[PDB]
Amino acid sequence: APMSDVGGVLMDKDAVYIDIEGEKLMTGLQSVEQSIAEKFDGVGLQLFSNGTELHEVA
């Protein structure tokens, strides 16, 4: 049944409507702002023990 809700899923237009300490982590995870790739940009590695931090490969 396309228009009718089958199981718990109902589809209208382009939007879909469905019926529905670890909890603290999930909410903390939900509230993250920076993307990993954006956090990825900031991080530098040391190639050697006393070498400079190299961020992006040339």
């Binding site: 995870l29 993307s35 990993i36």
Partner: peptide, 26 residues
């Protein structure tokens, strides 16, 4: 885990179908 973030077509979701921002598919 960290590569899943790099992928553009990987989406990490909870049991309530809410999008966690760790995903590349942001």
């Amino acid at each position: 885990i960290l590569s899943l973030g790099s992928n553009p077509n990987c989406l990490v979701v909870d049991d309530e179908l809410n999008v966690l921002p760790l995903s590349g598919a942001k």
